DNA sequence: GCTTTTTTTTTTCACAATCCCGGTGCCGAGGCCGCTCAATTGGTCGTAGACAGCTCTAGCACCGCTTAAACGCACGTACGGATTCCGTACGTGCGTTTAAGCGGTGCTAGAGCTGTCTACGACCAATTGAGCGGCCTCGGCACCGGGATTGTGAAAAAAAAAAGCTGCA
DNA sequence: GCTTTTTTTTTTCACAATCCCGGTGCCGAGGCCGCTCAATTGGTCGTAGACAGCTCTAGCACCGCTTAAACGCACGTACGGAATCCGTACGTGCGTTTAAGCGGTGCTAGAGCTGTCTACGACCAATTGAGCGGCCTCGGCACCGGGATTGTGAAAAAAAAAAGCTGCA
């Protein structure tokens, strides 16, 4: 139905593990949810502006990577 | 050197993601010179909270 | 003699055995259709490099783990130690990610 | 009989107050010699615009206020209305201030 | 001199009151200054840092504003 | 315009930080645009938490 | 001092996580090619900037008085935190269902390159107005005093309410 | 049923504080002025990127199999939040103490500008070797298996506190 929904409750239960987190009441895995798209909302437009900016149809690797760099969240590993 | 040392803890000749986020994070001047920086495929440092232990 | 384990016990164990991996926890391909499903509500008929998803997840995965330590403290914070969305919520008016 | 506020009554007057207004709440003097002081540990015999400790001034009362506002948050979340160190302490370790 | 007690208490009181704070710990006060203190610290180390790459013997408040951007605690209105 | 308004609505002919700061704080997106940004002379806006009041 | 419940502690079993074997197998580090193009060498030439030398801004310090602000105490309300208490929201551990992942094939959009051409920007020099620093008016704002309005809080009414008293089919 | 008692609830009623008003007088917003410097106009050369035309990379579609993860659900323990209770930390307000803020004059470090000159980077071309993709091979790391070893809980029976009983001082 909605793709945000294949972000299951067993896979936030593993993030909020590795995020050290014992205990997480229900309501969490909807409001995850919502941050995550947001986080994915703000990423992706940003990417895509330096993809339509390029005359692409594409959306490279770096096109994220200065998408995140920009969002004060940089990353390492991909063609920094 | 110390992502090295990182591996050669883990028996490993080889240094990978993590061993690189070890020596980042457990160094603390790095690790501010880093701060805003994700590694990838470097999970974080084994941290629980004292309260969430048993007695 | 059915074993079990006390509420908690097994989270602690799933706690330390998550912080000692490094590998990614959401489903890739849910995750990789989700991606999809947003970019084309900025353009029509995008494609991605493999490379660009992983990027992305890579990104997605590190940032919420990094909420869930602050959302933790939180919750910690309040004399619990159960998360709630208020707990999320503050940290993120704090980070200054929401007014 | 003597007339008497109650606690908090007055609390809430000075931040009604103090929110309304613009004007800086350290006192100039003793804030200029502060500047002063931490100056020398790093380099002696320095001069100082006027308008240099004017700008000191202006953003250690803005950072402040700030702080305070997320640390009035922080103990409002575990249900006290009195900030505590603790408070500050939090604030400043989800800001990143702090490790 | 030994400055740092002229932030007096009233003082940190007036500014957590512009902050919206109603009930003040009694640790708080020592607790503040601590932390104005740190951000001084900073601020200024960085903008003395500025000065003397100009050779000058003199704080101007462009080194001040070039040291709080450099915090990303931009100041506007000092010849910003 | 924004600043302007604030003015006219402290019943002043000149702009000043004040009214800047009120016109750029309660807009949402020009709060957005600077939320990193100090206005000296600005003070905050009144905004006291509920819980606080009395009852 | 005793009894009568519940704690807290101490002492067996259980289950996962791990070290140490040993063996196996896969692919990507690792390092060797053979150009190649991008860094070294050499040389000439401009100007960015070190330095002197001067002006004259603004930073500093110092006195002296007024008064607001800070300082320290007495007093007391409401706050924070400790306890007890209860309901069910979560974690656990089964079975049951589902689709992620793997490995493979098959197509082709479109990334990404090479080469050609020229419109569009650096460059220069003459021109010359928009924008600067300096300076002088004059009306908005800072401040004051005084009255009008708002808002809190104590103690004294109106009313509601909640128990004790009487009769009561 | 109704009287009595009691807390709420609600209204009066003083008093502090905050808001508007006009009156005053001072100082920087505002605009004018005359000069200077940077923008414009109108030259020429040069190439940086738009464009076509090609290659062939890697991004998508799709199928079939093997589990492994996702999903419900039965069950109960441990958490959260509500409620009550209580000592004292914090707010409020008082007299007393401090020193900031005010204005002023007096002094001069040094910020800042101007003119000189030279050592240092730019720009260029010829040289030439370090670094480039492109390949090819072996041992370092995934993986399985099994069987210690060590760790880390749960439970169950014991070894201490909690409350409750007196009656008793
Ligand atoms: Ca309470
Ligand atoms: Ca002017
Ligand atoms: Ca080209
Ligand atoms: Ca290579």
């Given at each position: 139905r909605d793709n945000i929904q294949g972000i299951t409750k067993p896979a936030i239960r593993r993030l909020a593990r590795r995020g050290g987190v014992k205990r997480i009441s229900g309501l969490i895995y909807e409001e995850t949810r919502g941050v995550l798209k947001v986080f994915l909302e703000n990423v992706i437009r940003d990417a895509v502006t330096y993809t339509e900016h390029a005359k692409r149809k594409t959306v490279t690797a770096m096109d994220v990577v200065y998408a995140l760099k920009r969002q004060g969240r940089t990353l390492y590993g991909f063609g920094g | 050197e110390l992502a090295g040392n990182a591996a050669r803890d883990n028996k490993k000749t080889r240094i990978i993601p993590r061993h690189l986020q070890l020596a980042i994070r457990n160094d603390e001047e790095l690790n501010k010179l880093l701060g805003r920086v994700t590694i990838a495929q470097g999970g974080v440092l084994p941290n629980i909270q004292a309260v969430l232990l048993p007695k | 003699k059915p074993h079990r384990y006390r509420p908690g016990t097994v989270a602690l164990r799933e706690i330390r055995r998550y912080?000692?991996?490094?590998?990614?926890?959401?489903?890739?391909?849910?995750?990789?259709?989700?991606?999809?499903?947003?970019?084309?509500?900025?353009?029509?008929?995008?494609?991605?490099?493999?490379?660009?998803?992983?990027?992305?997840?890579?990104?997605?995965?590190?940032?919420?783990?990094?909420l869930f330590e602050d959302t933790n403290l939180c919750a910690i914070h309040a004399k619990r130690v159960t998360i709630m969305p208020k707990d999320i919520q503050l940290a993120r008016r704090i980070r200054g990610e929401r007014a």
């Open positions: - | - | 912080q000692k991996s490094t590998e990614l926890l959401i489903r890739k391909l849910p995750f990789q259709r989700l991606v999809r499903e947003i970019a084309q509500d900025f353009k029509t008929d995008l494609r991605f490099q493999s490379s660009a998803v992983m990027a992305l997840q890579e990104a997605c995965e590190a940032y919420l783990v990094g």
